Amino acid sequence: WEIDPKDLTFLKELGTGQFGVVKYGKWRGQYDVAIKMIKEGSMSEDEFIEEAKVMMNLSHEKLVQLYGVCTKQRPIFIITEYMANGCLLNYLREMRHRFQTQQLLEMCKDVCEAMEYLESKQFLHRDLAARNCLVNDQGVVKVSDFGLSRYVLDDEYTSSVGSKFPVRWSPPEVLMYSKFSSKSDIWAFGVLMWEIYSLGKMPYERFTNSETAEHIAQGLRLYRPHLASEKVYTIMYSCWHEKADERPTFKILLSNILDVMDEE
Ligand SMILES: COc1ccc(F)cc1C(=O)NCc1ccc(-c2nn([C@@H](C)C(F)(F)F)c(N)c2C(N)=O)cc1
């Protein structure tokens, strides 16, 4: 799990975010990697380092691989698979100019495969959204930052009443009782399908976070994006049953997605 910084070559800065600056580089001069230089005070570093091996064991082709950490310096670096097309949210917005609707369903299938694998390990993502998915050079969407919110220090992001909490991707039991489960990741997956079919629009854009929480509690749900067929909308809507036990599993969503692919 411990990578020697001597083996990294830094080649270009890709951007920055909540948890630090990201650079593209090579490991041992040969293998592409992305390197995130963790923002001081943003994460519970000792706890993340001890459990970096846990996340490194989650190996599925549709999960962005965590390769290791560099911890013998400040700041700590997190080394991952390089995703040349960057975050899915921005990539959807760029796609508006040139795309086939069948590509949208393939993106949903990629994320659903990763989530079925996490579900099989009873591993909660806790913040599934287009901004936490990445896209590689071949247009494959993969899920990233799985389980990271448990190590975030800022309560504005982790608390269900924090200004920065992902309210628009949360079911009623998370907003009210902070009750996370595989079924809250299912709800967020339905919102992510809506983000894909809306080419990166913000969910519930006319409403504030507090209004959105009330809207959801009243049973109101996102509309069908015009690119989604009624069969696709039925799948995303199935993620939004008020009762968590009524929502499907990722194995069921994957089969439904594969049925629509085989039919349309
Ligand atoms: C799989 O990783 C994890 C799994 C579990 C967990 F709990 C935490 C992590 C984690 O912290 N990973 C560190 C990391 C995260 C995202 C990028 C990245 N970001 N971006 C862009 C948006 C940008 F703009 F930031 F560069 C890429 N293209 C990136 C790229 N990989 O090409 C790089 C490294």
Domain ranges of the chain: 5-81, 86-263
The annotation places the binding site for dasatinib at 80-83
76: exposed, middle or buried (Cβ count in 10 Å: 0-12, 13-18, 19+): buried
Topology agreement, domain 5-81 and domain 86-263 = no
Contacts of 238 (CB under 8 A, 6+ apart): 190, 247, 248, 253, 256
| Spacing, Cα 170 to ligand 1 middle (Å) | 22
* Final resolution, Å: 1.5
Ligand 1 atom with the shortest distance to the CA of 36: 34
The token pair that represents 185 in the structure block: 């990741």
Phi, psi of 153 (to 5 degrees): -85, -35
Determine the Cα–Cα distance for residues 69 and 6; give it in Å rounded to an integer. Answer: 13
**CATH (residue range 5-81):** 3.30.200.20
Beta strands per DSSP E along the chain = 8-17, 20-27, 31-38, 66-70, 77-80, 86-87, 133-135, 141-143
Active site residue 127: yes
Q: Which of 21, 144, 151, 152 to mutate to test the pocket of ligand 1 (most atoms within 8 A of CB)?
A: 144
Determine the Cα–Cα distance for residues 130 and 118; give it in Å rounded to an integer. Answer: 17
**CATH (residue range 86-263):** 1.10.510.10
Q: Name beta bridge partners: 86.
A: 135
Contacts of 101 (CB under 8 A, 6+ apart): 227
Catalytic, out of 110, 127, 145, 185:
127
> What CA–CA distances, in Å, run from 34 to 49, 97, 181?
18, 28, 30
